[PDB]
Amino acid sequence: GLSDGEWQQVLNVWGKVEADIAGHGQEVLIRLFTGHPETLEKFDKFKHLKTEAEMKASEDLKKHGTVVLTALGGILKKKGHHEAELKPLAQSHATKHKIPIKYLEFISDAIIHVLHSKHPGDFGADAQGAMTKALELFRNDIAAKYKELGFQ
C-alpha cells in the first residue's frame, strides 16, 4: 500500500529507466545472474552464458531485459491496480517457468542496486523507500497467487 506521494516518486524514478529501458534491463539481469548464478539455470536461452562479458555482449539478453522492464513498468504505472497485468505473470512464472518467490526478491534488490549504480547521488532516500515498497507490493501479490497454486 503506497501513498500518492510515494507512487509519484516511483513513477519519477521510473522516468529514469524509460530513458534507457534496454540499458537498465540489461544491467538488472546481469546483476541478478552474477549475484545469484542459480537463477541463470532457469533460462534455457541464457544458460550458455558463462562469463559476464558474454552477458554484456548478448543482444538477446538486452532484448529480454526490455521485455521484463516493459512489463514491470506497465504494472508500476497501474499504481497497485495491477491484477489483470500481474495474474498471467504469476501464472507463467509459477507453472511454466517455475520461479520461486526468493528469486523475485533477488531481482527486486538488483533493481535497487542498478538504480544507485546508474544514478549515484540521484536516487535519494525517499526515492529508494518508495521503489522498495512498490517492488514489495508486486512481490507480495505474486506470492499470493503462488500460494493459491501451491507453488514453492
Which amino acids are annotated as binding site for heme b, given as ranges?
93
C-beta of 56 vs 87, nearer to ligand HEM: 87
Contact 40, 49 (CB under 8 A): yes
C-alpha 71/C-alpha 123 separation (Å) is: 22
C-beta of 20 vs 38, nearer to ligand HEM: 38
C-beta of 127 vs 135, nearer to ligand HEM: 135
Cell of 10: 516511483
Smallest distance from the beta carbon of 98 to ligand HEM, in angstroms? Answer: 8
Q: Which sign, positive or negative, has the C-alpha torsion 74, 79, 85, 90?
A: positive
Binding-site residue positions: 64, 93
- How many Cβ atoms are within 10 Å of 90's Cβ, its own excluded? 21
Binding-site residue positions for O2: 64
Q: Which residues bind ligand HEM (CB under 6 A)?
A: 39, 42-45, 67-68, 71-72, 89, 92-93, 97, 99, 103-104, 107
